[PDB]
């Protein structure tokens, strides 16, 4: 099915403690493949997955050029924001950006993104048509107006339907053995008495890729949305992921509860009972 490429970047101002640090990473799907750290002492875009090292030195020469560039740009943008918002020059502020594209089963273009966030909150972002902009407050409209007289959407739209799609498609062949796998979750159940009246039932899903997964409990076929304890999908390290779901149940009733798993690498959804 589909695939996605994402670059995420964080600039952070540290006044007095020196200069805005700038960190950027790239993903295909849920696998990190490149990075850039403004405080690295290397000042080169670095590899992070094995299948990106096959790219030659002109690649690393290029990408380092684009992402050192953008780093200085946002470093100034941090100043423009502290202007538009009337903030003091002793506080730390964060500038975050993501952009990328999603493609179908054929490698055709599907949807593109180009968004910014100041200090944890939506600032400006490109619409779905990739023609118009969505500013989030007054300061971002000053910037929204600037970026329509400049036809910046035109520019970013050109990158997304072309360069973004082209390069992902390339990486999807370079790493087809890592990136086109789907690993189904191995699943088990655990069980523990809290009191002499109750017990916990924990439904575990280990070692799957990609990250999407659903884990839901039921009692006599009834969704137990509010008594369920459900953790964030977490990374194992090797590039698989983990997730579990937990219910407290009364001692002697563990047979009415069931736990359902859905994943890509599962033909049929699974069901697990204690």
């Amino acid at each position: 099915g589909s695939h996605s490429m994402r670059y995420f970047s964080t600039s952070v101002s540290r006044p007095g403690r020196g200069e805005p640090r700038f960190i950027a990473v790239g993903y295909v799907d849920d696998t990190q493949f490149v990075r850039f750290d403004s405080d690295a002492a290397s000042q080169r875009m670095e590899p992070r997955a094995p299948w990106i090292e096959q790219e030659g030195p002109e690649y690393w020469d290029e990408e380092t050029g684009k992402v050192k560039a953008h780093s200085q740009t946002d470093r100034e943008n941090l100043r423009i924001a502290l202007r538009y918002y009337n903030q003091s020059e002793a506080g730390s502020h964060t500038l975050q950006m993501m952009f990328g594209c999603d493609v179908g089963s054929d490698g055709r273009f599907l949807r593109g993104y180009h968004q910014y966030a100041y200090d944890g909150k939506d600032y400006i972002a490109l619409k779905e048509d990739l023609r118009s902009w969505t500013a989030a407050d007054m300061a971002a409209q000053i910037t929204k107006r600037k970026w329509e007289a400049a036809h910046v959407a035109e520019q970013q739209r050109a990158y997304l339907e072309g360069t973004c799609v082209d390069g992902l498609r390339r990486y999807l062949e370079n790493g087809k053995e890592t990136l086109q796998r789907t690993d189904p979750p191995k699943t088990h159940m655990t069980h523990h008495p809290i009191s002499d009246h109750e017990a916990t039932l924990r439904c575990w899903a280990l070692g799957f890729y990609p990250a999407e997964i659903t884990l839901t409990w039921q009692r006599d076929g009834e969704d137990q949305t509010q008594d369920t304890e459900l953790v964030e999908t977490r990374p194992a390290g090797d590039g698989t992921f983990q997730k579990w779901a937990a219910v407290v149940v009364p001692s002697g009733e563990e047979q009415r509860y069931t736990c359902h798993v859905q994943h890509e690498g599962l033909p049929k959804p699974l069901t697990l009972r204690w």
Partner: peptide, 9 residues
């Protein structure tokens, strides 16, 4: 492949 163009606010 990183982006090509970058704008100021």
């Amino acid at each position: 492949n990183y982006n090509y163009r970058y704008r100021l606010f």
